[PDB]
C-alpha cells in the first residue's frame, strides 16, 4: 500500500524533473503553506514555471503507477474514486476518468485564474504511512497532486 505510494512519489518526481525540468532548487511561484489531516505528512517542493507540462507528467506518473499495479491492487482502485471524488469507474476506465476529472477541475477559474501565492492543502482522513505532497509550483499542477493525494489517503483506509 505505502509501497505503492512511494512509487508514485518517485515517479512523479522523476517524470517531473524530466519532462517539466524541475529541481528541488527551482523557485516556487506557489508555495504550500499548511498541510492538515497514524500518518506522516511532508511537502517536497519540485517547482517549475510551466503548468501544462507539470500536469502531463503527474498523469503519466499516475498512469504508469496504475498500470504497474497488480490485478488485485487494481480491483481495489474503483472504490477509492467514489470515496475521494464522488465518481464511479472501473479497472478498464480509471485512467481516462481520472484525466477528465483533472482536465475539467484543474482548468477551472478557481484553479487557473487564482493569483494566491500561498496555498493550503487539507485532507480529512489518513491511516506509520509517510505521505509526500510534491509542490509543483502551479495551481494547475498542485491541483492534480491534490487529486492523487485524495485517492492515496482514502486508500489507506483499508
Amino acid at each position: 500500500i505505502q509501497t505503492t505510494v512511494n512509487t508514485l512519489s518517485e515517479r512523479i518526481s522523476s517524470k517531473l524533473e524530466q519532462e517539466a525540468n524541475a529541481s528541488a532548487q527551482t523557485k516556487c511561484d506557489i508555495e504550500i503553506g499548511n498541510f492538515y489531516i497514524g500518518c506522516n505528512i511532508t511537502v517536497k517542493n519540485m517547482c517549475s514555471a510551466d503548468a501544462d507540462a507539470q500536469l502531463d507528467a503527474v498523469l503519466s506518473a499516475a498512469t504508469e503507477t496504475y498500470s504497474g499495479l497488480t490485478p488485485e491492487q487494481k480491483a481495489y482502485v474503483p472504490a477509492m474514486f467514489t470515496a475521494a471524488l464522488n465518481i464511479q469507474t472501473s479497472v478498464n476506465t480509471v485512467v481516462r476518468d481520472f484525466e477528465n476529472y483533472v482536465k475539467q477541475t484543474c482548468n477551472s477559474s478557481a484553479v487557473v485564474d487564482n493569483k494566491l501565492k500561498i496555498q493550503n492543502v487539507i485532507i480529512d482522513e489518513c491511516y506509520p504511512t509517510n505521505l509526500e505532497f510534491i509542490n509543483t509550483g502551479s495551481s494547475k499542477g498542485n491541483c492534480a497532486i491534490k487529486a492523487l493525494m485524495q485517492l492515496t489517503t482514502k486508500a489507506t483506509t483499508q
Partner: antibody, heavy 119, light 108 residues
Framework: QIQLQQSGAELARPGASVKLSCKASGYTFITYWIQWVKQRPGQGLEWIGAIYPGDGDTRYTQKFKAKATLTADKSSSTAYMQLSTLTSEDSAVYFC????????????WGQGTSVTVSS | DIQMTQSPASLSASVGETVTITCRTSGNIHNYLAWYQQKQGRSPQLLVNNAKTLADGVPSRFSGSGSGTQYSLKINSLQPEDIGSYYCQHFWITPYTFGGGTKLEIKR
C-alpha cells in the same frame, strides 16, 4: 467599509475615446481582481472582463477585446477601462466590481458611469 | 463557451406567494454561480454566492439551489421590496457570462 468610486457621467464623441476610472478603498486593492460589466439602457448585464491589479493580468470577453483596455494603478488603487472607437452601442452604463483572488462573483459594486456617445 | 438561459424573463405574483427563477447552462458549472438583484437605477447587489450561499444582509426568503446545469433562485413569501431585475452569473471558467434577466413585478 469597501467602496468602489467610479468616474462621473461623461459625454463622449462618436469614433473617439473615453477612459473610465474605478477607485478602490477599504481593502488590499492589489490582492483582489477587478471586473467590469456593461449595461445598455434598458438591457441586461454584459461581462467585459477583469484585471488583476498586482500582476496586471487581464481576461476579456471576445466582443470587447477590441473596444476596451483594462489597466490598474497600484499606487492610486484605481482601475481603468479605456473605450475606443465609440459607436452608439457603447452608449451604456459601465460598472466596476470587486472579485476574489480569482475573478469569481462581484460582491461589492461601483455606482456606475453613464456614457453617452454623441455629436 | 458557457451559455446561460434564465427563465422566465418576466414574473408577476401576489405578496407572499413563492417565486422561482431558473438558470440553465450549456455545460456543467459545478456550482460556480452567483445571483444578483438590481433595483431601478442602482448597481447590482449580490444575493447568493456559490449557487447556495446567501450573502450578508440578504433576507431569509431568498434561497438558491442547483446541481450541474440547472440552478434556481427561489423567493418564498414574495415582498414588494423584491421588485426589480434578477440576473445569474457563472464563474466556472473565463470568460464569464450573465443571464438574460428576470423582471419581478407584483400583482395587487
Amino acid at each position: 467599509q469597501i467602496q468602489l468610486q467610479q468616474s462621473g457621467a461623461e459625454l463622449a464623441r462618436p469614433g473617439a475615446s473615453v477612459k473610465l476610472s474605478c477607485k478602490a478603498s477599504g481593502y488590499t486593492f492589489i490582492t483582489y481582481w477587478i471586473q467590469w460589466v456593461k449595461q445598455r439602457p434598458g438591457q441586461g448585464l454584459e461581462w467585459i472582463g477583469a484585471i488583476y491589479p498586482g500582476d496586471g493580468d487581464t481576461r476579456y470577453t471576445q466582443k470587447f477585446k477590441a473596444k476596451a483596455t483594462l489597466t490598474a494603478d497600484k499606487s492610486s488603487s484605481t482601475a481603468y477601462m479605456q473605450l475606443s472607437t465609440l459607436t452608439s452601442e457603447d452608449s451604456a452604463v459601465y460598472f466596476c466590481a470587486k472579485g476574489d483572488t480569482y475573478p469569481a462573483a462581484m460582491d461589492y459594486w461601483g455606482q456606475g458611469t453613464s456614457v453617452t456617445v454623441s455629436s | 463557451d458557457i451559455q446561460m438561459t434564465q427563465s422566465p424573463a418576466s414574473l408577476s405574483a401576489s405578496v407572499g406567494e413563492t417565486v422561482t427563477i431558473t438558470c440553465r447552462t450549456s455545460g456543467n458549472i459545478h456550482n460556480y454561480l452567483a445571483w444578483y438583484q438590481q433595483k431601478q437605477g442602482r448597481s447590482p447587489q449580490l444575493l447568493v454566492n456559490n449557487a447556495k450561499t446567501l450573502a450578508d444582509g440578504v433576507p431569509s426568503r431568498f434561497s438558491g439551489s442547483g446541481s450541474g446545469t440547472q440552478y434556481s433562485l427561489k423567493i418564498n413569501s414574495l415582498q414588494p421590496e423584491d421588485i426589480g431585475s434578477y440576473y445569474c452569473q457563472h464563474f466556472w471558467i473565463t470568460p464569464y457570462t450573465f443571464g438574460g434577466g428576470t423582471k419581478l413585478e407584483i400583482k395587487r
